[PDB]
Amino acid sequence: KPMVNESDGVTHALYPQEARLRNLTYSSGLFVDVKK
């Protein structure tokens, strides 16, 4: 679900209003299983 990887800080849940006001991107993390 949309999260914020903010410098010198934790990754926390990003809601549309915050994204709108702090000029961030309402986007979520993409993860895949890598086989080797």
State the virtual CA torsion across 31, 15, 26, 16 in degrees, nearest 10.
Answer: 150
Amino acid letter for position 23:
N
| Resolution value in angstroms | 3.6
Task: Dump the DSSP string for 1-36.
Answer: --EEE-SSS-EEEPPHHHHHHTT-------------
Give the technique used to solve this structure. X-ray
The size of the chain, in residues, is 36
